[PDB]
């Protein structure tokens, strides 16, 4: 029973105290030092003894057990003649495991399933991949770090220990540790290790879970546009002579996170000084229950908007400069790619300044597109050499023209017009179309030669024979691949431009206003209630729910919202409010009701029911009114625009329901009368002895009961969280102080 474990622990503690009178006078923190003292497990050349060791009379050492017969069918399975130690001393014949393969006690099938869980996952993963057709061919390897094995959930390295602590020993954690843990991974890991922990020891299960949520990237030679997303199958699907075609999609939420980040960046560029707006909004948005900073840290993707948001949070980005379908990486350059504000005065009133980027000094850029791989060297706007490793007879139109656009080498466009300039995208499209139908600028820029050794044909094809050949274009003699030695650190511009710190300045890496990507689904569980952009939601129900959660749960936001709606001032949620209420004629009555409710009760912004009534009145007040219709009295309830959802002033039904016990907004209990934590908790105390208040079992256990004071245990210390009485968080008070300092500095 449960008492046997306590008995065993007590006897172990007593024996360790008696058998080791010293080794406990040391501090507990000395464990990190003396856990490594495990000598006498060392051995030398076990492989040079295996043949003899197996062929010894008694090779196997096991504990004394009665399940192994002394003699079975004339063979002596075990030997107890010597018994020098008599404990872990009896020796067994080499055939004992073979004997046990039969004639042995069995185990439940659940145990067998639990033991082979990860190996079975690997086997089904192998037998579930489509074994395609082998495509033999010469291949130029690309050495990159790739994930060793797939993970059930990707978590940033800082949050792995807290996730494991929440999975295995929640009773010895604090609320900060719980907040830093990935709760989705916690649930997945708990479900996975429920049967596994019954057959694996503590450390074995801990590190099995760690491996299930650890990336563990390793460098391997891969094939471009054939990345198997994991090195589990590289020996089968890849080599220097073949690949096996496979059809596997991403099945990852990185695309949705890109969509969310793109919406945030696009809406942030429309305000004043977008950088701090984006930073503040990223600190107020939560996907599922995880803060946006942590989920950005979790997903280290190649995508542009994800990279911009990761840089805004101080993290790194792996994004590479991409033109159409060709990726460019600067091997080394004298100066960063500069930009020229080429103004076009084609018309006096109609003039557009279209800026392009070029090189100054010498530079060497690696390019990759499909199977085409190589590098080129340039000086200023002149190409010196190009080396390409491409399959024979391949058309090199698009990669070469992407190179020309990247370096601004050919000069029909950029500084010129080849026709009136209007917008960046139109000019780029015209450039590409013009050079697609007229690709002679490359030939007049590079020159022609009659040598047959040069592989680039005048029609921009690889190894096709022709009378003339394109000069200074040769085959890639040696493998070339980008590699950065120093840890690149990125700089985010005030206009949300991602820069890389080059020696002589700043190198542009990601630049919005030309990142073309259509809108996509948002990540599930996204919470925009605390952010300034609720209109990102495309669903009226979600918009209304987020707006009402913002107003109800916080008094100051309700104050600001009511004030802006009543006085027609600019509000962050003007678009949402205008899109929620149909075109009506209740604005004047709503503003009136606001006036009498404010005058009658100056102390209204403390009862959530009053906040709900004021929010309803303000939402109607800030609605889009109709001109050619006389104003009417505000109704008790109205219907959301383009929907059958009812919003009610009395909050008896529909979108908001305020029962005596609790308030429900959009089917979710936002506020509970006595058991809730809307204002949060603060730590308030670390002690080595239990304080004078209740000790909860786990941090989440104390978060549900909602006591005024409770403690948690974590490595011999007690943390007694009580309550938050301040009406502001640390982040925005720090923001206010920093802005006040900088707004005294400006004079």
């Amino acid at each position: 029973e449960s008492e046997c474990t306590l008995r065993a622990l007590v006897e172990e503690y007593n024996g360790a105290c008696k058998e080791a009178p010293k080794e406990m006078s040391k501090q507990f923190t000395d464990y990190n030092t003396f856990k490594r003292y495990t000598t006498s497990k060392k051995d030398h050349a076990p492989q040079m003894r295996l043949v003899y060791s197996v062929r010894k009379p008694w090779p196997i050492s096991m504990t004394p057990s009665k399940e192994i017969p002394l003699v079975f069918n004339g063979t002596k399975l075990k030997d107890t003649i010597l018994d020098l130690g008599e404990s872990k001393r009896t020796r067994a014949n080499i055939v004992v495991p073979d004997y046990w393969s039969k004639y042995g006690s069995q185990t439940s099938l659940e145990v067998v399933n639990a033991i082979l869980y990860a190996e079975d996952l690997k086997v089904q993963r192998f037998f579930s991949t489509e074994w395609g057709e082998i495509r033999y061919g010469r291949m130029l390897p690309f050495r990159k770090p790739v994930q060793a094995c797939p993970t059930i959930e990707e978590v940033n390295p800082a949050s792995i220990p807290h996730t494991l602590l929440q999975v295995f020993c929640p009773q010895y954690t604090t609320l900060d540790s719980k907040r830093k843990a990935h709760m989705g991974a916690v649930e997945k890991l708990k479900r996975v290790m429920e049967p596994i922990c019954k057959v694996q020891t503590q450390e074995s299960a801990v590190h099995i879970a760690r491996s299930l949520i650890d990336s563990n990237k390793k460098w391997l030679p891969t094939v471009v546009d054939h990345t198997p997303r994991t090195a589990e199958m590289a020996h089968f699907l890849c080599s220097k002579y073949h690949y096996v075609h496979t059809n596997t999609q991403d099945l990852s939420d990185t695309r949705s996170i890109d969509n969310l980040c793109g919406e945030l960046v696009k809406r942030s560029l429309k305000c004043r000084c977008p950088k701090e707006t984006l930073v503040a909004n990223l600190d107020k948005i939560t996907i599922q229950g995880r803060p946006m900073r942590e989920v950005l840290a979790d997903h280290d993707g190649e995508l542009p908007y994800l990279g911009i948001c990761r840089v805004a949070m101080g993290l790194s980005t792996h994004h590479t400069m991409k033109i159409r379908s060709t990726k460019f990486s600067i091997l080394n350059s004298d100066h960063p790619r500069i930009e020229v504000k080429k103004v076009f005065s084609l018309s006096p009133d109609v003039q557009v300044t279209i800026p392009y980027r070029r090189f100054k000094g010498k530079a060497k850029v690696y390019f990759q597109n499909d199977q085409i791989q190589g590098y080129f060297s340039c000086t200023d706007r002149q190409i010196d050499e190009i080396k390409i490793s491409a399959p024979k007879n391949a058309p090199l139109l698009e990669p070469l023209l992407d190179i020309c656009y990247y370096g601004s080498f050919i000069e029909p466009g950029f500084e010129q017009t080849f026709g009136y300039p209007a917008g960046k995208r139109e000019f780029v499209d015209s450039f590409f179309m013009h050079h697609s139908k007229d690709h002679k600028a490359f030939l007049i820029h590079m020159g022609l030669d009659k040598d047959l050794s040069l592989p680039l044909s005048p029609e921009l094809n690889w190894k096709e024979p022709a009378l003339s050949k394109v000069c200074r274009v040769t085959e890639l003699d040696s493998t070339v691949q980008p590699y950065t030695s120093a840890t690149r650190e990125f700089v985010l511009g005030e206009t949300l431009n991602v820069y890389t710190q080059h020696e002589n300045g700043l190198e542009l890496l990601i630049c919005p206003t030309e990142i073309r990507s259509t809108r996509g689904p948002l990540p599930p569980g996204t919470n925009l209630s605390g952010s300034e952009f609720i209109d990102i939601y495309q669903d009226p129900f979600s918009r209304a729910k987020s707006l009402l959660k913002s107003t109800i749960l916080h008094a100051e936001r309700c104050k600001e919202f009511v004030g802006n709606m009543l006085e027609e001032y600019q509000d962050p949620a003007e678009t949402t409010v205008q899109s929620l209420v149909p075109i009506n004629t209740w604005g004047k009555s709503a503003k009136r009701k606001l006036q009498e409710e404010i005058t009658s009760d100056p102390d209204w912004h403390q009862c959530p029911r009053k906040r709900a009534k004021m929010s309803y009145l303000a939402i109607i007040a800030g609605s889009i009114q109709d001109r050619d219709k006389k104003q009417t009295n505000v109704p008790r309830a109205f219907m959301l625009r383009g929907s059958q959802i009812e919003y009610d002033m009395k909050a008896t039904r529909g979108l908001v329901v305020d029962t005596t016990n609790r308030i429900i907004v959009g089917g979710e209990t936002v506020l509970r009368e006595g058991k809730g934590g809307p204002e949060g908790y603060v730590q308030t105390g670390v002690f080595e002895e239990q304080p004078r208040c209740y000790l909860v079992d786990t941090p989440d256990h104390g978060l549900s009961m909602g006591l005024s004071r409770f403690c948690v245990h974590s490595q011999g210390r007690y943390f007694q969280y009580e309550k938050k009485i301040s009406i502001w968080e640390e982040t925005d008070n720090i923001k206010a102080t920093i802005d006040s300092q900088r707004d005294l500095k400006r004079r």
Partner: protein, 51 residues
């Protein structure tokens, strides 16, 4: 919380069900695939069995 688990229908499909419920609540009747959807709809089951 799972009471009875059947080998025919693994209990991991409750993740798919809850994901669908949340997506539908968020105004998205159709949602992107998740890993638990692999053994929920027999994706690549024909190829698995054949191989």
């Amino acid at each position: 919380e799972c009471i009875r688990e059947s080998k025919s229908t693994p209990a991991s499909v409750i993740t798919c069900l809850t994901s669908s419920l949340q997506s539908f609540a968020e105004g998205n009747p159709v949602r992107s695939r998740i890993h638990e959807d692999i053994i929920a709809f027999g994706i690549n089951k024909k190829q698995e069995k054949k191989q």
